[PDB]
Subunit: 153 residues, 5 copies
C-alpha cells in the first residue's frame, strides 16, 4: 500500500541498553527495506542517551539538509528501564513530550521509538529478543515512518 523507494529515512538511536537498541534498529531497518526504501537512504546515527534524542534529532535533520540529503521522516530510538530512583519517570516524561512536539518544529514525522519498561525482560520482549513472545516494535516504527511521510502528500 505504501511506497518508500523515494524516501530518505533517519534512525537516531541511544547507546544505553545497546543490545536491546541494536535489535530495535535492525527491525526498523528490516521493515524499511521491505517498503522499498533504498540502502543509501537509510541513515543511522547515534546519541549517548534518550534525553539527547530530541535535540539530536533536530541537529541530525539540520545536518542532512545542509548535506543536500534531507530526511522525510525520523525514528528516534531509546530504551529506558525503571531503576531505583525517579530518573526513569522524568526522562520518559520530557523525552516523550519533546519528540511529540518535534513533529511540528521539524516539519517531518517523528516516530516514537522509545521503550518505557519496568523490567529488562519487558524491553527484550518488545525488541523481539525473547522467542515465541510478542514482536519487534522496531518493525512497527519502520512501517509508521513510511506511511506518515507518504499518506498525506
Amino acid at each position: 500500500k505504501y511506497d518508500g523507494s523515494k524516501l530518505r529515512i533517519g534512525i537516531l538511536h541511544a547507546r544505553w541498553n545497546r543490545k536491546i537498541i541494536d535489535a530495535l534498529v535492525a527491525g526498523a531497518v528490516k521493515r524499511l527495506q521491505e517498503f522499498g526504501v533504498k540502502e543509501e537512504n537509510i541513515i543511522i546515527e547515534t546519541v549517548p542517551g534518550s534525553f539527547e534524542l530530541p535535540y539530536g534529532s533536530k541537529l541530525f535533520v539540520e545536518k542532512q539538509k545542509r548535506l543536500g540529503k534531507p530526511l522525510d521522516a525520523i525514528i528516534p530510538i531509546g530504551v529506558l528501564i525503571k531503576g531505583s530512583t525517579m530518573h526513569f519517570e522524568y526522562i520518559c516524561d520530557s523525552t516523550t513530550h519533546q519528540l511529540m512536539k518535534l513533529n511540528f518544529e521539524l516539519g517531518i514525522p517523528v516516530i516514537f521509538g522509545v521503550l518505557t519498561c519496568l523490567t529488562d525482560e519487558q524491553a527484550e520482549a518488545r525488541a523481539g529478543l525473547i522467542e515465541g513472545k510478542m514482536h519487534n516494535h522496531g518493525e512497527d516504527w519502520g512501517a509508521a515512518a513510511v506511511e506518515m511521510a507518504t499518506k498525506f502528500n
Copy 2:
C-alpha cells in the same frame, strides 16, 4: 440547536484495537448525520497509533486545504489499553496535551476522541459494544464537533 449541514468534518483514527475503533468511528458518523452533516463531507482517514494522531491531524488538515475542501473540525480517535509497561501512560499524556494544543495551532475544533482505559471491557463499554452498559462515546464527539464549529460564528 446545532446544524452541521454546511460543515465538513474530519475523522482521523488509529488502527490498534480496530474492533473498538470501528465502533467509535461509526458512532461519530451516525451522530454527524443526525446533525445534518452530509456523507460526502465526512472524511475518514487512518494512522497506525495514537501517537500519530496529533501530527496526522495536522497533515490531514493541510491536505484538505490544498484540495480546496477545508475541514471545519476534526475528531482524532484512538483507543489505549493499559499494558504491562509504562508505554500506556506516556502515550496518553503526550497525545492528550498535543490534541488539546492543536485546537489553537490548527484554528479549528479538535475533539478528544481517545479512550484511556485499564481493561478491554472498559473500552468496549465506552464504544457501546456491551449490550446494556453505558453508551457509545463516539456519538458525543460528533455532537461536540458540530457545536464547537458553529456556536461562536
Copy 3:
C-alpha cells in the same frame, strides 16, 4: 474592595454534571453582582465538556470582540469526577494547563473554575449543595475575576 460596575465578565460552563455546574455558576453570578457587575454584563455560554473549555473560551472571547462587547475576564467552569478509567486524569491535566496558559494567550484573567473530585459528594460539597458543609467555590471564582481585572490597572 473591588468595584466591578464597569466590567464585563464571561462565564463558560460545561454541561456534564449539570446540577453541580448550575450551582457553581449561580455562586459566581451572585458574587459578581455583589461586587457591582451588572446582569447585562454577565455573559453565560456553554460547551459539551471540560476538554472544550480552553478552546471554547478563545472562541467566546473572539466572538465578544467582534460584537464590540469585549470580556474583561472569563470563568471556565467544569466538574470532573474520577471514574473507572484514566479519562479523569488526562482531561484534568491538559485542561488545567491550557486554562493556565490562556491567561497569557487571551490577555485577560482566566479563573480556574474546574472541580477535580473523586466522588460526587466532594463536588456537591464544594458547590454549596451540602447543607452544613464547606461553601460554594463558584463565589470565590466570582470574587477572583473582579479582583484580577481591576487590581493591576
Copy 4:
C-alpha cells in the same frame, strides 16, 4: 554576599493559609534587607490563590513598568496543602510549570515561593513557625532573588 542596594524586588503572595504566608513573606523581606535592598524597593502585592500567581506576576511586573518603577526580580509566594480532592495536584502542577516558564517570558528572575505540602505542620515548619524544626524557606527565596538579578549582569 551579593549587593541588592540598586534592586527593586516584587513579592506577590496568595491569601489562602495567611498565617503561613505572612511568615514566608516576612522571611523574604528580612533577607532582602540583609542584602541591601531598601524598604521602598520591596513591593508587596496580593492575589486570591496560587493559580493567580503566574498571571498576577505578569500584571504586577507590567504595572510597575507603567509606574516607572520596574522590578528586577519577583517572588510569587503561595501555600498549597493537600486536601481530599485532586485540586491540590492540578493547581501545584500548572502553577509550578507556568512560574518556571515565566522566567523567560518576563525577562526577570522568578523565584519559586510555593510550598506544596501534605499537611499543615509541614508548611509551618518550612515557614519557621515551629520552634525546634527547620528554617523559613522565605529567607532562601530572598537570597535567591538578589543573586539571580545580579550574578549575570
Copy 5:
C-alpha cells in the same frame, strides 16, 4: 571519538547537597579534559537551587556571549532528594521539562545533569561517592556535552 580541543563547555550547578554536587562537577570536569577541552574553556558557575538552573543557564549563556567567550554546550547540574512534602515532585518535573526545551531555545546542547533520587544514598552512589557502587554520572555528562556539540558539525 570526539575532539573537544576547540570547545568551551559551561557547568552551572546548584548549591544544596554540595558534597554530591561537587563530586558530579569533578567527574564532568575530568571527562571534559580527557576529550581535550582546555581548563580555561571549562567555566563553572553556580545558582542556589535546581529551580534556578534553567533560567540561570540562559543568563549564563547570554553572559558568555557578551564576554566574547561563548559556550558550545552547557551542563546544568543539580541534586534532588525526596523529602516529606511534594516539593521534590514539582521541582523535578518543571526543571526537567525546561532544561529539555532549553536545548532548542539556546541553540546549544543542554546536558541533563540533575539527579532525582528518593534517598541520599542513591544520589551518593550515582555521584561515585560509594566505592564499588555504580559510577559517577558526572563523567557521562562531560562526554555527552562534547559529543552533542561536535557530532553534527
